[PDB]
Amino acid sequence: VNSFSGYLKLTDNVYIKNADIVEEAKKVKPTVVVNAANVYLKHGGGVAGALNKATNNAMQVESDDYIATNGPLKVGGSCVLSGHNLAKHCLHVVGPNVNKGEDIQLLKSAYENFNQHEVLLAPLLSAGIFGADPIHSLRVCVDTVRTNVYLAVFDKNLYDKLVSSFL
Numbered sequence: 184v185n186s187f188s189g190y191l192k193l194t195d196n197v198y199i200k201n202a203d204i205v206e207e208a209k210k211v212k213p214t215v216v217v218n219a220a221n222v223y224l225k226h227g228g229g230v231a232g233a234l235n236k237a238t239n240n241a242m243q244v245e246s247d248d249y250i251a252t253n254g255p256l257k258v259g260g261s262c263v264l265s266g267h268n269l270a271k272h273c274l275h276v277v278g279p280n281v282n283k284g285e286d287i288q289l290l291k292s293a294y295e296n297f298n299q300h301e302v303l304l305a306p307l308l309s310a311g312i313f314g315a316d317p318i319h320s321l322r323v324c325v326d327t328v329r330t331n332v333y334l335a336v337f338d339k340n341l342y343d344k345l346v347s348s349f350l
């Protein structure tokens with residue numbers, strides 16, 4: 184039993200809700216919140232910009248130190264950093280950005296990072312400003328993640344479309 188509330192159950196381990204991941208994180212304080220990161224951990228917009236703003240820029244400060252030490256992430260890769268006031272940990276995961284020409288096959292590799300964590304609150308990877316089809320992202324998620332994932336979808340119209348078209 185965990186503290187997530189109001190989710191539709193898609194599969195044994197994947198749950199979905201129309202919710203702002205920022206507000207959801209602030210309420211649940213999950214062990215792991217997933218960020219829709221880029222390789223530079225520059226949290227300018229989208230989910231990343233929103234999560235960082237909610238930390239009063241502390242996520243960005245921590246991230247800049249991480250990059251200065253380790254260099255950029257790989258597309259499809261991840262790193263674990265602090266969750267600040269939102270969660271215990273933030274798993275920064277880099278899905279391919281279609282608006283940069285990156286290979287969509289790397290979306291499966293990106294979701295594989297979730298399997299290192301028993302329970303996660305997460306957005307759909309590569310959706311939104313990353314330019315991929317969110318329906319496809321949901322399919323890859325369901326077919327790749329085996330741990331318990333609670334997906335927050337900000338846009339209500341998109342949420343209804345994902346549910347109604349889910350196989």
Ligand SMILES: O=C1CC[C@@H](c2cccs2)N1Nc1ncnc2[nH]c(Cl)cc12
Pocket residue numbers: 202203204205229230233306307309310311312313314317335336337338341
């Ligand atoms: O709903 C969705 C679906 C895909 C993703 C994207 C939208 C546009 C580009 S990628 N997306 N976005 C969010 N998902 C959860 N919480 C959020 N909070 C804010 Cl702010 C935005 C947001």
